[PDB]
C-alpha cells in the first residue's frame, strides 16, 4: 500500500527472529515447532538465511542491538528501490612510497 509498486519481499532480522522462523512450521498447518532447520542461522557462512515460504528473502542482522526485524520491498528495477547507492568510484587502490624515507 505504501509504495504502490509491490509488497514486501525480504526480511532482515535478528538472529533470534530467524531462529524462530527456522524452528516453526511456516506452512499452513495445525501447529508445530522443533529444532531449527528451515533457514541457516550461521553467520559464518552467510547472511542470507533462506526464503520464508518461498516468498521473502530472509537475512540476518548480526548487529541488532536489541532484537528486531525489518521487512521491505525491492522491485526488479533500480528505480524501484527506496534506497540508492550510486558508487561512481569504489575500492580504488593507491600504491607507491614516500621517498623521503622510502617506506611503502
Amino acid at each position: 500500500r505504501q509504495t504502490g509498486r509491490g509488497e514486501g519481499n525480504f526480511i532482515i532480522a535478528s538472529r533470534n527472529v530467524v531462529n524462530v522462523l527456522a524452528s516453526v512450521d511456516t506452512g499452513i498447518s495445525y501447529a508445530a515447532q522443533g529444532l531449527a532447520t528451515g533457514f541457516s542461522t550461521d553467520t559464518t557462512k552467510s547472511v542470507f538465511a533462506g526464503v520464508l515460504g518461498g516468498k521473502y528473502r530472509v537475512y540476518i542482522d548480526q548487529y541488532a542491538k536489541q532484537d528486531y526485524f525489518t521487512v521491505g520491498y525491492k522491485g526488479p528495477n533500480e528505480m524501484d528501490a527506496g534506497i540508492y547507492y550510486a558508487p561512481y568510484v569504489a575500492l580504488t587502490p593507491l600504491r607507491g612510497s614516500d621517498p623521503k624515507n622510502f617506506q611503502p
Partner: protein, 52 residues
C-alpha cells in the same frame, strides 16, 4: 555481506548526480496548495472530478 541485495545502484559517471520524478497532478495548476496526485497509492481517486 549483502550490501546491495536490496539496493538500487545505477552508478553515476559524475559525482553529485540527480534523479527526476513525475506525479500525475489534477486541479489545473500542477503547482498549487491542495493540488492532488491522480494516481496516489494511498489516497483514493476522486470519482466526482471526472463526473458530477
Amino acid at each position: 555481506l549483502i550490501a546491495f541485495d536490496i539496493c538500487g545502484v545505477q552508478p553515476m559517471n559524475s559525482p553529485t548526480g540527480q534523479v527526476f520524478a513525475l506525479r500525475a497532478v489534477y486541479g489545473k495548476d500542477p503547482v498549487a496548495a491542495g493540488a492532488k496526485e491522480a494516481f496516489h497509492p494511498m489516497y483514493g481517486p476522486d470519482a466526482m472530478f471526472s463526473g458530477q
